[PDB]
Symmetry: C3
Subunit: 425 residues, 3 copies
């Protein structure tokens, strides 16, 4: 019994009521006013991993596997009133952040009105190290290096909040400094506070022409705070223990090289790390390396200091000739953009990692760990196929060798293979 | 060996195959047909908090802190076939909703064909109270009032489902009524059912010209249902216990003023709350207040009724002269839109809260709680800087004073400071 | 003291810097280049359920209820460089996927360059069965059939990863085959591997003209793997036990018809399922049916094989005359598109389910389960109102009858009613 008069509707046009808008899609969406006042970008990244691995990587030394998303970010960011930016990256694979506090890769607000100086607030990784500054989309090896695993608090947000100032300097350098509160309380409920500094001199800072040297410093205050002091490196093999899908389960060997899961309040106070970075690129050839040293300083006399030192060096070469992109803002490498659309770009890489842990609190042998300094060396050799700007397929061989620590089989080395399908939008 | 013929592609235009579309961005995205048949809006809100607090707010009285996102909503909403709307707001900070049932601020469908009458279905807060009706983007104080904390079931969805009818009445009033199922079962697995009514007379209902009086009623049936009867107010300080980041941990004092965590099935049945609201605004000056009273009625003779009464009153003044927006649809205040683009808008506020809990089931002193009526008063004094329509920076001082309840230090008062950076898109 | 020169800004136009773009909205958003190289689609589905049920569906036989979202998907998908697609569907109701590994309905990458052959990778349901292939938006009954509940591993992703090849064949058939790793490890940490095949002959494959016969096969290797072998059908009543809101709680009877929650490593190895499908449609009338049989083969001599057999048959008729859509790609039914905009489309359906479980490991009676074959029959009778393309409102009556298993009241049958409000965008 419902009825209505019919209408002739205007069709086909797309307009706006404010400033002219430009819209773009490469699989996601970008919308922006041409006066630069407002913008919105929806994107993301999918990293689908399959790996198999044995020896030291597993407890009994037999072959385990893993089938998981390393990352599955949805990424929302935008600009309002020209100078105010936000970026919210949440990880559907649940590898980043937590159930309690949100699965954030990033949730930040940045004021850019003092360009080149930026002021950044919210939940975001502190700036320590070149490989960490580099987007996880474009890190050359499948996982970041083992030296960071000696003190991963230096460049993770740990479910807290921070404030950072950063700037490029005269088109030849980049500096950042920040303070953060991390999610661990002392006996009064006051969070661990942390300071970071990073400074890079990069007189050459473009794709295929990079010369880069930098320094990093991180400090945190653990006064009267119970915390996990364990150093537990995965040595390039994420699948030994990971969220986002299937892993090695009870047979994964993510081993404790030093420290303990529950260091009591009052056991430690000062924790500091110094780092160096260096990078060079000429056309398709690049070399980069980082070194860091940690001192976790005991407070109570019953406890001894824990020290650790580590480094990596990486060679990479684009067989098809393209350069790795480089950005002075953030002093970081970025993507490879394929020149040949029919075969894509093909990149080979080798990274060597070396770490040492000195924990004088270990005074007795266990079944798998000998008194003294524990050590590991890792080799990561692989290929990245950039099919196009959106899709990257990778395969890598990973090998590790240890000293004064084994798995239950007595293995002092292990190896594995990892394959990844990545889609960026 | 792959090859193909080259093409000349048409570039630059943006069109549609249906009715004309208008697109907008202020940091998010809106897309809508001009015939009002279809629309889509992607937005959200980030609320980044840092606070420090002591006295009654902590167990030992020493200073704790908190560094967390109060809310981090992603907001998707749209219209189809003119009269059918959806709204899905999910909270990445995990402060709203749950791991079991979804982190929903809202997941609703609304039929608007009977305009001004709306029919709303799904998971959404029942309509009780002016400050609750007001968007959490634009609530003047950093947290909502303590009177609601006496019975927070009246205007939370508790992971259930509901149906609501609402309407404005002759451009002078607003009414709503709803039924909901809440996520708690009786011994047969049948959910707690709840009824809400709200009615407001607002003959003046525009920004800078408001006169508003209203009544609220809520009822729920707890027959044969085990439930948490605790009244545990945070008294303006979210950081004593919160998700979305770091809080006061084991030293936070979110104290139980009355009730118990596990009231057995059969202990209570009727639970009802009556409320009043009043608001007035003239230009940049506004005053608002609410009062409510709860009776939780015992069923089994071993149990005594629990009663509670509370109110708040708030003064607010925009120093820079702008009015608080007001909407008759929902009978609620909304944002401040800054007039001066160089300095933004500056707002000062004071809210006073007063609550009383009468629990005759408490018959013996504990170390921190005395037999009789427990009471609290709170004062919230602060500044909101609306930098622009998207960004609001706040700072507030909060003080509380209690009667017949203390922390472990014997403190009967406490205070703290909270700062927030908010970004809306 | 801040000041600036004023500007005249160009307003109103919407353009792009690349190939021409077409944008669309029906409540969500689609953006695509006209050369088919790039596209993006944001959509989703909300399924709001309320049900009441008693008898066998509850433990004591009294009436329970449920008020929950069955699904609340946000759906992001797109195309890049013509031949590379992604699809990421995450479920805000937390009914799909997990807290540990992500709430994915789907997270996949598809290469389509070998059209009609597709290559699909990531986390997605293996292809077994017509009703499972059919979108959950458009499955006719409120829940899928009970035969699938006899072996739900055959067409669920179980938080793992997979690779699938599929193709239509000469506009008369459809085939798919895939391998997957499922999230359960043997004692070495190696995941359960699974193979699927599906093949359908559908010489008539359009809306209102369907003739469809198909075969399914699934196999998994459980060697040295501890696993949950329970068969626990909900028999059409989701609310007896569900996430996404309120359910029957401790009085829900999702009963174990066979198998055990912790079958030890070494107890079983081969697990295989064969299935048949058939479908026919002429205008508004459709008939479909599936049959499957499972053999879970014991490894260790202490264990006996577990077998199960089940089928369903469904009649459906659109009273208002419209056809159910059908797609050869995926060999599946899809939506009903209403022809009359004032009253929508009205569909009646009846589905009959029949299952039998043979578990010779059950050698003693329990209080509710008798030695021998357990059986259930279910009847699902209901109405779907397609208000418009976006909104579907459903109501259904469900009845079940069991053999050799009861609830605690001794009930051998039960019934219930389910209502759903669905919004697709």
């Amino acid at each position: 019994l419902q009825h209505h008069h019919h209408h002739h509707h205007l069709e086909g046009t797309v307009t706006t009521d404010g400033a002219d808008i430009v819209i773009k899609t490469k699989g996601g969406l970008e919308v922006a006013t041409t006066d630069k006042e407002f913008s919105f970008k929806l994107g993301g990244r999918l990293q689908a991993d399959y790996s198999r691995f044995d020896g030291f990587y597993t407890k009994n030394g037999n072959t385990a596997d893993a089938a998981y998303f390393r990352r599955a970010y949805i990424e929302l960011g935008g600009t309002a009133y020209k100078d105010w930016k936000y970026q919210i990256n949440f990880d559907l694979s649940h590898n980043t952040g937590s159930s309690d506090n949100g699965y954030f890769d990033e949730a930040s607000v940045t004021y850019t009105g003092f360009n080149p100086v930026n002021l950044k607030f919210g939940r975001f990784y502190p700036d320590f190290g070149l490989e960490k500054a580099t987007s996880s989309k474009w890190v050359t090896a499948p996982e970041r290096n083992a030296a960071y695993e000696l003190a991963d608090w230096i460049n993770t947000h740990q479910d807290g909040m921070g404030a950072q100032v950063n700037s490029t300097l005269a088109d030849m350098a980049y500096l950042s400094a920040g303070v953060s509160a991390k999610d661990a309380d002392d006996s009064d409920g006051d969070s661990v506070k942390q300071f970071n500094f990073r400074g890079v001199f990069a007189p050459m800072h473009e794709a295929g022409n990079v010369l880069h040297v930098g320094v990093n410093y991180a400090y945190r205050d653990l006064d009267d705070t119970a915390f996990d002091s364990r150093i537990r490196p995965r040595l390039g093999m994420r699948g030994i223990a990971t969220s986002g899908g299937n892993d090695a389960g009870d047979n994964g060997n993510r081993a404790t090289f030093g420290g303990v899961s529950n260091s009591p309040a009052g056991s430690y106070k000062d924790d500091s790390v110094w780092g160096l970075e260096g990078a060079w690129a000429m056309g398709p050839f690049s070399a980069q390396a980082e070194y860091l040293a940690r001192k976790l300083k005991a407070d109570d006399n019953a406890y001894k200091d824990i020290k650790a030192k580590g480094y990596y060096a990486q060679l990479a070469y684009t067989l098809t000739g393209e350069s790795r992109q480089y950005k002075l803002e953030g002093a970081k490498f970025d993507s490879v953009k394929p020149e040949n659309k029919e075969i894509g770009a093909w990149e080979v890489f080798y990274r060597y990692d070396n770490i040492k842990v000195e924990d004088d609190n270990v005074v007795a042998d266990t079944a798998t760990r000998e008194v003294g300094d524990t050590k590991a060396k890792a080799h990561n050799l692989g290929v990245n196929w950039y099919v196009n700007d959106a899709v990257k397929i990778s395969a890598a061989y990973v090998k590790a060798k240890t000293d004064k620590i084994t798995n239950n089989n007595g293995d002092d080395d292990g190896d594995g293979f990892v394959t990844r399908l990545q889609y960026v939008f």
